[PDB]
Amino acid sequence: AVHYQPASPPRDACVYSSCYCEENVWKLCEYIKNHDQYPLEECYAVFISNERKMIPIWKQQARPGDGPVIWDYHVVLLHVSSGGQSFIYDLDTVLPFPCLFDTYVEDAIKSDDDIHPQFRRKFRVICADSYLKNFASDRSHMKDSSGNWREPPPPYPCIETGDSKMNLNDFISMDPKVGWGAVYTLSEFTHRFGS
């Protein structure tokens, strides 16, 4: 659908802290829930990681022109629009915000075929309503031994729920028996959402 209206504000107006992608995506989900543009049911938080927590992603703001960046995990927002098309909202991409799903997979993710197997990408896809209901982080993974902050934490209170003050590892995990949502290989992920 060629007149797609973004589900979020423009990039420069969105809540963002570098290296807190899980929260940046949570805040996009909250915005969408709080507005009347799109049903929340059309939206997903997507964690990208693997067993070794070393995943390349290209077209990244942290290293433009000379990708990939190797992340422990990265999180983006996926919107499956009614118009025949999914879109990726990744505040850390140099691709457009938002970006057509097929373009994001082609240019940011790329094929796993010739990637060293321990760097191959898996995807945990969580419905946005479930992500808002269930996610919790006390940010403790970003404080080192010293104990200093690896990157400055966001200024608003930690996201917590009645059931947990910290379950980030259950979203980073690509073990299908753990956590919420469904875990997909790159092939299964593109089969589900690709055009």
Swiss-Prot record:
Keyword terms: Cytoplasm, Hydrolase, Nucleus
A biological process from GO: protein modification process
Domain of life: Eukaryota
GO MF entry, a single one: protein-N-terminal glutamine amidohydrolase activity
NADP as UniProt keyword: no
Keyword Hydrolase: yes
Gene Ontology CC annotation, any one: nucleus
UniProt-annotated catalytic positions: 21, 74, 90
EC number annotated for this UniProt entry: 3.5.1.122
Catalytic activity: N-terminal L-glutaminyl-[protein] + H2O = N-terminal L-glutamyl-[protein] + NH4(+)
Localization of this protein: Cytoplasm, Cytosol; Nucleus
InterPro entries in UniProt: N_Gln_amidohydro_ab_roll_sf, NTAQ1, Prot_N_Gln_amidohydro_ab_roll
Function, in words: Mediates the side-chain deamidation of N-terminal glutamine residues to glutamate, an important step in N-end rule pathway of protein degradation. Conversion of the resulting N-terminal glutamine to glutamate renders the protein susceptible to arginylation, polyubiquitination and degradation as specified by the N-end rule. Does not act on substrates with internal or C-terminal glutamine and does not act on non-glutamine residues in any position. Does not deaminate acetylated N-terminal glutamine.
Record's subunit section: Monomer.
Family: Belongs to the NTAQ1 family.
PANTHER family: PROTEIN N-TERMINAL GLUTAMINE AMIDOHYDROLASE (PTHR13035:SF0)
Descriptive protein name: Protein N-terminal glutamine amidohydrolase
Protein species of origin: Homo sapiens (Human)
